[PDB]
């Protein structure tokens, strides 16, 4: 008698091909899957990142940790002071807090800016500080993107040619003036008999500041804005001009009304504009109308040793105060910048404006040790190489790829029967 | 028909591994049981399936470093990279399926081999998973001993 | 010498699959036919070859997206990409050749198995593709029945 | 008796190695091959491309389809008018057709230009319109390369300072003048007693035009060319100057003879040069000699949302007319531009200059639904990943790679024998 | 236990390929020799190992063209490329190890097959590498002839 | 009796997994390994490279081969003359050797520079030739990086406006002057009664020179440096200025003291600065103070057809002479430049300064036919795809990757037993 083990399959069995043997099975299981994506900020390397902030990441605040959007361990990685902002430190307006931001980190988190919003009510002849704000942070983010470190330079070497010129003061600026730019005025220029002499100055951007190497400087090349030359001739002879030159004489900034049209707003009066520019280290010259001279007195120093795309955190007040979205729009138009944004209003635990539940959730990733990818869509762990939807750029690290779930191959499971040869 | 072949059955009729017998009176007329106690096969299947984790973990563990400063998705490049990764995954799949098939087939040979040495040399192999027993040497309780059904 | 071995022949002498016989008078002196009616093998070969299209289509279907604005050919980069693709194709090739070999060998085992069960248990297997028949049990027309040559 | 199936091979059999089993065979077949390459223009995505053209793609032409180099379905995808060209619309010369080109498409086909060739005989003090042509299309192609859309801006907001200055007219320009630039002249400046006053003007490049977002503008910053200052002092006091400034006063174009040498051709007389520049949106100033002022009045608006390398089609007359190859050379020197060129003369079916058999063959690919790659060598389908010869850049899509036919591995065919183990 | 199985041994006890025998008096009590003259196996092992050079040379011969003008190492990109290459090398490794295993196993089948045809049909196969000899047909010098130990 | 071949393993055996069969073995061997890296210079293509040098690669030197750092076959691939340097040929100082360097090669080796070091003692009012040196080679290396060829242009077409101005001579410059720039002086300008007339000049950068296509030119836009205007008014009226303009009037170089601060060193006297700039072909204008005019008279012509990263070889004297490391620092700050540096002093076989054993070792690779990769770490052959440590950039060719030795998989060796199925 012939006795045999017999192999049989049903209509329920489907054939799975292999290189060196096929398999019949009734069930399949996907071979792998998608990795979750978490919204908010994080880092891929806990030992090489730096944060810059204000009260909301300042562990020395009287109301810590109720006033904090991050736990202690994360706060230690921040350079923050209550009331501070990069922009506040750039200009140093009267009575505002003046923190010397400095640090190194290939990954960078900017969670600051709200302390100079429209709510601040800083005047100082400002044409539009919200515009100045957007322009300033744009330059910062661009420079920070390719730098390992950043430091405020709280005082540039400066020299003016005039011996009669004196320090400027304005009723609109707390009867004082900015730390930067410095304001020098000639009291004798009166459009009677006197026109005075053209003012001159130099300012130097250093090659270093403390332990920090400087390859690039963000500075403001400010100028005054009048609405017409008739309106200007209330103060100075001829048109207004304030021009900025490098060492050789190449015009690099300023406003010259000998050739450019006036654009002062109707009956607004005198305004100041302060566009930020990225300049190399060196000595720079200034030529201006006799009565008024503006000279840059601070900068932000960056290197070019490289860095990762940066993360910028929404910096706005609670609903009761007047905010702006300048750092958002600065970030959006700047390559290599990732913006983190709340979907609900800011409601603080300490007071109205510090200690928000949503932001704490969004910033919680800054304390994780297993983040491998950071993107504009959020951050991931290293589970699989795939995600259900694209990770939007900017992004860096071991970043997952989008594929349809249907293209993920399966493996046989359940009852299984091997097959080889043609069987016919 | 013996371990080198897989056959199909219609309608109901369970699929899997069964005992089959042939002649007797001349000419006989088939017969197929309704599956024995092949718990070895079920256990081997379990082990083989779990052994695939190694190859899968190797794939999951490999994720290319990237850095993009660009603000708009490069969709076509993104899709190309995925397609290439899916291609690799497909080759690994085909390797795994074959690795299961070959190792299950071998495990089945190892089952049949134990049967041969159980009724030795009563068994008389006729290709893998098939035997010739002279229903003279072996009663019904001996065949019950040798084939366990 | 039986399905586990492949031998060489000189000059003319057709290659392929043939019937071989051994002893008789003690000592005998070989003999190899000139190929039987193994149309199964020819048919299986045909099927196996056509089954390679799946793996080939998979490769052909995969073409990386690119975008170059440059006006001069980057020849070295172009060649490197081709070399990598050719490398992948070479691995697939080695997988396909083995997949043919294993499935043809199995198909040959399946041919020999049918022969065993045709003269059962007259056949008596001596490794794959080899049998021991006692030229007492089997005439010449029985061997003609069992081996069909 | 021992009976065995025996496996044997000939000298004709060669061994093919495998991972898990070898194969003997007499014949081999290549595993895959090369994909054909078709010369001419095409697209990888029929739902996202745009064409800009003239009569040869204008379905409203009286002689359609005899006058067309493309079938109806392709013509519907073009923005074309008989007699038109991008350059014609840029300047708007007297009596020429003035089509408002506008459209969106990631893939772009430019089949236009011939309608302002030397055959046109347009003078208007043009120093060398063929040079202006090459320069204009260069700027267009560069800007189009990184833009999704394009639109003519048929009228810039402009304002001149002078109240006495009047619109310019020339016998060499059909007793009229271009639409762009505008020409303003002071009749009172006579080198007797009068030198007049320096002329001023502003022109604005908008941030948008209709539904089209503008990130970049192609404009002409024209200036007059005299051969020497003596020759200029026949019209104006002092040297000639026409300078272009941005909002701050940075010189961005024009010709200033206070510092630059004259380069007017000997006894040629007054000539006008009109280099094209890519400028950001904003308000721009102009300073010029008292008697003559040139002001840009049109532009081409582009975005920076991105696009594919563009395709430019040879735009020349039949042999009987005077053509140029300016758009060819513009394309050749511009990154991301693919040029399509005939090998035989243009012989039209409608008339001499419209409906050419070769061009129809070359443009036929614009109607295909299965093109995966577009290159300077032509376009391909997705048959294999390989081509016999390189696909020359620029190129985009699923583009094939060159490899030698000998490096394409083979597979065993014909009579086949499996082999495994050492067999010894 | 016969070529389909690999067993473990503790303490000392050499590993490898040995001759094993079973019953006799009913019931018997095992026995395993101390390795015969399987110089074929040693020679086949040598050949199979040397045959791996082809696959290795293929890998070594493939090096991607690059061009970097940058002055600072892009460490993360550098490491990613290496990791991908190591991944490929790992797949080739798994292919090679299996290719050795399958071809050695086949070479072992080819050794056992020669033994079967040496004492034919005295041998009587009981799965690969196992035989049933009736210690009536075969003395001790015949078994010495057939199994060479 | 049952007789079986039995397979057994020890504790010494470890299991190696395969796709389609496992293997037991006692020993393993690594599957592949690291490729050695050799320090020094080499090439991946012997048929497309060019060297530029001095005596140390000049086969015509009287003491060859004792005076050579390369063998004959390599020397034939160099364009060298004893006593020469790129910088020497750029300026052509009195009495120095003036070699016309020219050649083509996608791979480039610069082994030259030492012949104008501080040891040369060239004065010619040079503010700091070491600074000029670093700046000059920086421009050369940047331009060479993207060019196939290079040639000295030993004479630019030049034209000065003045008819009274005459050629300049200085006691500090061997009672003569440089070949470039040319020096033109007006003898009549005396700060008594006479101020003279502003000087003018043009110089043309050609589109080609001999068989060499020019897309880019390295030129010096020199200017004189005074310490203050009072010190300048010893020679000229008003401030010093020497300005460089392109065809349209855009300031591209020079020193203008009407707007830029003086930076002459205290009581140093008159100095000349000669920054190098990369300029397109065309005609350029010059405006200067009446008494002194400087005009560029030479250039280095490059194409933009592309090239590989270049190799620059340390060019210093033996210890007894005064050297600099300007070409080292030029190379370090320039993208795509690879620097080759000795670790021991230069000790020549011919004389002190020619024929060094270490340099010969470092340059020996220039004669190899099997180099596949060239990097800042050295060069490699095509043994394996791996190296033990990173190959530092810049680099090009078939370049190896760093991986840990532990990640290199192994293969079974020694006594081997196959395993398949579950064996239970
Ligand atoms: C440095 C200086 O000039 N300070 C006086 C300023 C200043 O001169 C004017 O603002 C000029 O404005 C500029 C920058 O162009 O003026 C001060 O008094 C002003 C007065 O000039 C103005 O007419 O009326 C203001 C009252 O609303 C104001 O008082 C000032 O701005 O405070 C006095 C400064 O000392
Ligand atoms: C706007 C204007 O000036 N129109 C008159 C022009 C024009 O002034 C001159 O071309 C100046 O040329 C420039 C642009 O520098 O001249 C017209 O008459 C000219 C005449 O000036 C010239 O001497 O002779 C010409 C005849 O060949 C011609 O008639 C003109 O160009 O038509 C009259 C314009 O009204
Ligand atoms: C072309 C020219 O001016 N040559 C005379 C030079 C030269 O004018 C001065 O250097 C001006 O320097 C510059 C370039 O600004 O001067 C020569 O004589 C000088 C003399 O002027 C200076 O007071 O004393 C020097 C002695 O140490 C020297 O003799 C010169 O430099 O040789 C004569 C040139 O003919
Ligand atoms: C290896 O070869 C086998 C046999 O040629 C292939 O098996 C075929 O698989 C397809 C499904 O892809 C089935 O429709 C055929 O019926 C199978 N043929 C046989 C004879 O069973 C198998 O696909 C190949 N392996 C790979 C990875 O391509
Ligand atoms: C084909 O056979 C399989 C297995 O022999 C059947 O699968 C069983 O289905 C029942 C009900 O769906 C389950 O409870 C069992 O668990 C399944 N078997 C196993 C081993 O899990 C299948 O239903 C059969 N199909 C047809 C159409 O007869
Ligand atoms: C080796 O054997 C093969 C097949 O046994 C021979 O191939 C045959 O060649 C003839 C003439 O060339 C063809 O008509 C047949 O079609 C081939 N066989 C098959 C199966 O197609 C080959 O000629 C032999 N070579 C030598 C040198 O004897
Ligand atoms: C798998 O292993 C086998 C056996 O070691 C390799 O077969 C050898 O292949 C070469 C040709 O490449 C022949 O010259 C040898 O004679 C073959 N050896 C034997 C014993 O047949 C085979 O190459 C390996 N597979 C791969 C893909 O490398
Ligand atoms: C396990 O068995 C292996 C082989 O049977 C033993 O390996 C031998 O070890 C000795 C001494 O170390 C060597 O001289 C031999 O050359 C090895 N054998 C071979 C074939 O090369 C191993 O020592 C055994 N291990 C234990 C713990 O008993
Ligand atoms: C192919 O399948 C076999 C069997 O499932 C795998 O073998 C296992 O390998 C691991 C080591 O990786 C051992 O610990 C297990 O004991 C093995 N199982 C058996 C039954 O022997 C093998 O790993 C698979 N091949 C690959 C490349 O993953
Ligand atoms: C099954 O696989 C997992 C790997 O995820 C392993 O940790 C576990 O030990 C395995 N179980 C068995 C019984 O082998
Ligand atoms: C052969 O392969 C092709 C795939 O190109 C398939 O369409 C066809 O059905 C196959 N033929 C058979 C008989 O399997
Ligand atoms: C062993 O492999 C090498 C390849 O490196 C080959 O040259 C040699 O001939 C091989 N030896 C044998 C005996 O096959």
Author numbering:
A (entry chain A), D (entry chain A), F (entry chain A): 3 to 193, 197 to 429
B (entry chain B), C (entry chain B), E (entry chain B): 9 to 157
What do the study's own words say?
ICV, however, has only one major surface glycoprotein, the hemagglutinin-esterase-fusion (HEF) protein, which possesses all-in-one of receptor binding, receptor destroying and membrane fusion activities. To further evaluate the infectivity and transmissibility of IDV, we expressed and purified the ectodomain of D/OK HEF, and determined that it also uses 9-O-Acetyl-Sia as its receptor by glycan microarray. We also solved the crystal structure of D/OK HEF, both in its native state (resolution of 2.4 Å) and in complex with its receptor analogue (resolution of 3.1 Å), and the structure of the enzymatically inactive HEF (resolution of 2.4 Å) alone and in complex with two receptor analogs respectively (both resolutions of 2.2 Å). Indeed, our results show that IDV HEF is functionally and structurally similar to ICV HEF, but with some distinct characteristics.
To avoid the enzymatic cleavage of the receptor substrates, we generated the catalytic mutant for the binding experiments and for the structures of the relevant complexes. Thus, we designed the enzymatically inactive HEF protein (HEF-mut) containing S57A, D356A and H359A substitutions, and expressed it using the same method as wild type protein. For the IDV HEF-mut/receptor complex structures, interpretable electron density is observed for all the three glycan rings of 9-O-Ac-3'SleC, including Neu5,9Ac2 (9-O-Ac-Sia-1), galactose-2 (Gal-2), and N-acetylglucosamine-3 (GlcNAc-3); while for 9-O-Ac-3'SLN, electron density for the first two sugars is well defined. But the majority of the interactions between ligands and IDV HEF are made by the 9-O-Ac-Sia-1 moiety, whereas the glycan portion of the ligands do not make significant contacts with IDV HEF, except for a hydrogen bond between the Gal-2 of 9-O-Ac-3'SLN and S173. Compared with the ICV HEF receptor complex, the 9-O-Ac-Sia-1 of the receptor bound to IDV HEF displays a very similar orientation. The 9-O-acetyl group of the receptor docks into a nonpolar, hydrophobic pocket, formed by V275, F229, F240 and F297. The 5-N-acetyl group of the ligand fits into a hydrophobic pocket formed mainly by W185, and forms a hydrogen-bonding interaction with A172.
